[PDB]
């Protein structure tokens, strides 16, 4: 007799040609680890709720993993998913992929600096970039990788010379104010 | 055993290339502030229900904000979203964007005056237009920005000369009656 | 632990370029008047459940209406929606739109007579057509507006001469039997 | 606090240009007759749950039927839907439509024999085909209407000569084994 | 008053031209066998929940099966679905389809080895491949069926000569490290 | 630190260079970057193999031997990496 919302579970599939509904694996693993740790029900219910979030190749991995060992716990299943799909990158490769990341031909430069900031957090978690220079490399990698121009270059090089460098939100404010 | 409705939560993403499901940020913030203020559950549940309404770049901001400070409250998270995505416009820029807004080449003029009225409310909230002339600028900005013609121009200039000017609903009634 | 259906609320938007999900306004108003009259919860809950059924320009009207008067009741909100979107047609215009309605170039004539019957109910509610001639004008407006031919014309003119004229369902049966 | 499935109600519309969500009428009537007979709630709730399953022209029939008689019961509403949309075919026409049904240019012959078997059940319910020859007409109408060839023709004519003829499932097994 | 997730039931249809929502039959049968064995409700409820997961040709089989015997149990219904749609392959055909499976022209070779591993599990369940050589045939069928090249061929032939051969996850790790 | 990191990573084998000369040129830029504290010394070997493999005009079984060395565990010193690249130069 009462109406209610209905959150669509985060489906994952592991296909390279991912459909518009389907998350990157790290977001799905955050959902699956919630089901594994948090939810109060037995492991048989947990396995079912994890499997329902999976489609295509990733669901086939769930079948393979259970077929080898029906006595397995969901925590060990997620270790198999982390091993097959969870990214493995080295310090060399995380540094290179951050530095090689330029503004794409269709991007607004405000969207590029946000995309680039996700790669910086990735690289800091690998300990591939020291946190105490993250601001320097933000201004540098924006200026080296963006399709930049006009007085935005002047304001960014001024900020590089200013002393205390921008946080990410402040650098976005500058780039947005020039986007107008 | 009972059937019920199922409201799709308002998803937001912050991409400039927004998908057809995805709201403008101000509508999403109205939903997220409901979850922050109203709902009775602890901050850990509130964070989860806010994060589930987010997809793509805006979800990456939720991860960044939590990673800097896991002790943060949802109210302070929404202040970070307001700062990154919530619009910052000055009196000069809100006045200019209202006045520069013409009827688009495919629009019916009845749809244009409704679109234009949203920009007037925006400008009044910045205190960029005095409320006591909002009617005058509606008739003027319709007449200056629309692809207008015929006896609708005559009726609108007559209304400009009439003394007491139209409210928005009355101006729409006139423009709709000429749309037939 | 139990599974259940999930009725998608009837979304409305008021755009002329309406998306395939989105109802004509009169169907949405039937849903919104159910929420206004029937549902047991306070006006603050009613406002929220009405607003969740709205998207795009029609949601912007809900914001405008509430911003002018936060003390308003949902019944008075629906009067503002009726005034802005609810159709206003005169006896002259309802008579003309019924009579001007021909079978569209892609229509099957069985679909045309059903479309046409909706316009007759509209015109009868304006008192623009006397109920006691509705059958006569159905056969006439089918015969004058359809892409008709063959022995279906003969059977329809025979029915016009028969004495007691078809009801709508009987006229559809005839047109369907010739559709085969 | 608990997650659950959410079955999408079977929407029907009665348009000839039916959208990919929308069932053939006979499947919708099976759902609507469940709501009419089975569900425990009063007729006012039953009318609402039937109307929510309807979209476009079929919803307009629900409005017409209720407008003529607000005192009507849902059973009598479904009799009006059966009369307008429910198929009326004679023995001659059901026999002809079964026999005229050939394999379509894009069909696999295994899909054709399943499509054809639905038309045989239809014809048997009209008493247009005696049940005691249904097997004979399956092999004949497959062989006369399919884009058949190779040793599948030989195996089918052998089965026609074998004595005890295939059931539908056995005929599908043969046609599937040649599909490989 | 509370919000909740809403898992979309796994729809199946049995059309060869399957829509993007629709599972392979073996995944649907895993859902339908859960409804048949596990769920506590009577067989009449079980039949309804199975039928709601079906669309198009597969729903027509549910109608045929019930029409022949209304006294049937859901377990015997799923035996009819297994017989009509569940795959029947011999040892010869499962061996041939595994060996004939090459990397498709658009595939990344990491996706190909995962696709190929599903066919190996299929063949092992038919007892068509001895488990004690599954690793040998993985490296061979990758090397014979892939669009392979570069030092990945050298590393794979080295692994073939190494003594203890890769598990599937280890072979994927190698192929992924060369995908970079 | 930003500019020394960028100039090291942006340094590819020039169109006329032998790859043995390129890895020596590249090693001078690594010492420069380590003196700015722009690269941690404890990963200098990893970035040598990576920046050779990403910046060189490499090919043949030299790529295989270099990726093998990247997987080997204990990575080459500069002199050992030059020995490998010289032995393939022949």
From Swiss-Prot, chains A, B, C, D, E:
The entry's note on the tissues where this protein occurs is:
Expressed in the cerebrum, cerebellum and testis.
Give the keywords, sorted: Acetylation, Nucleus
Gene Ontology CC: nucleolus
Cellular localization per UniProt: Nucleus, Nucleolus
Location, primary (coarse class): nucleus
| UniProt similarity note | Belongs to the PNMA family.
Protein's recorded name:
Paraneoplastic antigen Ma2 homolog
Natural source organism = Mus musculus
Q: Which gene encodes it?
A: Pnma2
């Amino acid at each position: 007799l009462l109406p209610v919302k209905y959150c669509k579970m985060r489906i994952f599939s592991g296909s390279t040609a991912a459909a518009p509904e389907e998350e990157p694996f790290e977001v799905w693993l955050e959902q699956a680890t919630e089901i594994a740790k948090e939810w109060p029900i037995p492991e048989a219910e947990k396995k079912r709720w994890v499997a329902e979030s999976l489609r295509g190749p990733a669901l086939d991995l769930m079948h393979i993993v259970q077929a080898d060992n029906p006595s397995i716990s969901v925590g060990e299943c997620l270790e198999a998913f982390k091993q097959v799909f969870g990214s493995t990158e080295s310090r060399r490769t995380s540094q290179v992929k951050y530095l090689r990341t330029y503004q794409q031909e269709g991007e607004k430069i405000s969207a590029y600096v946000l995309r680039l900031e996700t790669l910086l957090r990735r690289a800091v978690e690998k300990r591939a970039i020291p946190r105490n220079i993250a601001d320097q490399v933000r201004l540098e990698q924006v200026m080296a990788g963006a399709n930049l121009g006009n007085v935005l270059w002047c304001r960014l090089q001024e900020l590089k010379d200013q002393g205390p460098l921008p946080t990410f939100l402040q650098l976005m404010k500058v780039i947005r104010e020039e986007e107008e």
